[PDB]
Amino acid sequence: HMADKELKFLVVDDFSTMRRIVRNLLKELGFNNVEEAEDGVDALNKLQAGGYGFVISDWDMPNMDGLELLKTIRADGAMSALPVLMVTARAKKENIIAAAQAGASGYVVKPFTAATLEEKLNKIFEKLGM
| Nearest approach, Cβ of residue 68 and Mn ion (Å) | 13
C-alpha span between 20 and 15 (Å, rounded): 9
Binding residue (CB under 5 A) for Mn ion from 60, 62, 97, 113: 60
| Nearest approach, Cβ of residue 50 and Mn ion (Å) | 26
Long-range contact set of residues 75-80: C-beta below 8 Å, sequence gap at least 24 = 78/48, 79/47
Among the candidate windows 33-41, 46-54, 57-65, 92-100, which touches Mn ion by CB under 5 A? Answer: 57-65
Is residue 14 near Mn ion by the rule CB under 5 A? yes
Is residue 42 near Mn ion by the rule CB under 5 A? no
By beta-carbon proximity to Mn ion, the closer residue of 19 and 71 is 19
C-alpha span between 17 and 27 (Å, rounded): 16
Is residue 126 near Mn ion by the rule CB under 5 A? no
Q: Strands 54-57 and 84-88, how do they pair? A: parallel
C-alpha span between 55 and 49 (Å, rounded): 14
Binding residue (CB under 5 A) for Mn ion from 58, 90, 102, 106: 58
